[PDB]
UniProtKB/Swiss-Prot annotation:
It is found in: Secreted. Disulfide bonds join 9-14. Bactericidal activity; inhibits closely related Lactobacilli, Listeria monocytogenes and ivanovvi, Enterococcus faecalis, Carnobacterium sp and Brocothrix thermosphacta. It comes from Latilactobacillus sakei. This is Bacteriocin sakacin-P. GO terms for biological process: defense response to bacterium; killing of cells of another organism. Signal peptide: none annotated. Keywords: Antibiotic, Antimicrobial, Bacteriocin, Disulfide bond, Secreted. The chain holds residues 19 to 61 of 61 of the full protein. GO terms for cellular component: extracellular region.
Length: 43
């Protein structure tokens, strides 16, 4: 399911093996990067 390039599909876009990390990143970019990321994404 998760082993390589495009396999994990997975949000219909086929979310890439980085999926949930890039999810948390993009979420806290929208929430907190107005401060420059003073708290940031997953610490």
């Amino acid at each position: 399911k998760y082993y390589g390039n495009g396999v994990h599909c997975g949000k219909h876009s086929c979310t890439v093996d980085w999926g949930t990390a890039i999810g948390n990143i993009g979420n806290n970019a929208a929430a907190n990067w107005a401060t420059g990321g003073n708290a940031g994404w997953n610490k």
